[PDB]
Design a protein around this ligand. Structure first.
Ligand SMILES: [Co+2]
Ligand SMILES: [Co+2]
Ligand SMILES: [Co+2]
Ligand SMILES: [Co+2]
Ligand SMILES: [Co+2]
Ligand SMILES: [Co+2]
Length: 162
RNA sequence: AUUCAGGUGAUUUGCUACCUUUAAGUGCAGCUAGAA
């Protein structure tokens, strides 16, 4: 899995169909919204999930949760690093998506954080993919709500270029 | 941004483990010290 950004035009397009699709741009944002690198690939779709910074309510999400996967530094639990918001993952088109170029990125603190995140994500990549798969299954079955409408998004997204 | 998914224990509070590919109650705490 890897860090991506997604183009606004694409986000705005999907937002037409489901407003739960994550916000991509904001003046308050110090860096572009980052997503995680192919969390589910099924039925010919590729999903990315948005990362989000710590908020108070996160304290109540249990490891067993399908909506959220909490991030923290390997071996250092008190260093919370936000969470992957699986319930707002979205199918993507490769041309509307773009890997962060960490190699050319200046050595800021944010970069350091990205690397504490990556190491944790990588060590848990399977857990993450498995939660994504079960999340979407439950949503197809009508067993879970308050997530992006995966069927609807899956239905319109390849029409973006039109 | 979008403010805690449901469930597995003849009992089950917290966290955790487990199941959700239809199956699945483990572990640490807490509480208990009972009697065949
Ligand atoms: Co780490
Ligand atoms: Co750890
Ligand atoms: Co639950
Ligand atoms: Co099932
Ligand atoms: Co059924
Ligand atoms: Co178990």
């Amino acid at each position: 899995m890897k860090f991506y950004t997604i183009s606004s035009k694409y986000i705005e397009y999907l937002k037409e169909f489901d407003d739960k699709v994550p916000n991509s741009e904001d003046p308050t944002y110090q860096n572009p919204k980052a997503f995680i690198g192919i969390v589910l690939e099924i039925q010919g779709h590729k999903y990315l999930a948005p990362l989000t910074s710590p908020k108070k309510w996160h304290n109540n999400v249990k490891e067993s949760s399908l909506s959220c996967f909490k991030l923290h530094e390997n071996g250092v639990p008190e260093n919370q690093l936000g969470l992957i918001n699986l319930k707002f993952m979205i199918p993507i088109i490769e041309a509307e998506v773009s890997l962060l170029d960490l190699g050319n990125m200046p050595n800021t603190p944010y970069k350091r954080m990205l690397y504490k995140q990556l190491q944790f994500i990588r060590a848990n990549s399977d857990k993450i993919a498995s939660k994504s798969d079960t999340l979407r299954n439950l949503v197809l079955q009508g067993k879970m709500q308050g997530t992006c409408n995966f069927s609807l998004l899956e239905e319109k997204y390849r029409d973006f270029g039109k």
